[PDB]
Amino acid sequence: SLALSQIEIQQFLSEAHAEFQSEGFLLQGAVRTKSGTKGSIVHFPVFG
């Protein structure tokens, strides 16, 4: 019977869409990155 449409279900997906945004870290590899540093100020020595 067509009355089965009265108990139709709806599905809610678990993979969420994120509103269009930047993922970040775009400029990694474009600059000189140094990992695992310490302190409040990091000094880069320079030679002539």
Binding site: T37, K38, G39, S40
Partner: protein
Amino acid sequence: EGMANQKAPQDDITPMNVSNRDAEAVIEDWYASEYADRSFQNKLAVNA
């Protein structure tokens, strides 16, 4: 403290009253505390 007294013979005894008192020690709670923000973990050479 008690005390010895005198009385006439055959007279009723008259006690020298021994005082009583209760010394009440009231219990109190004390806390010594400090915070160590995680932003200082990499900026300190010591273990805060």
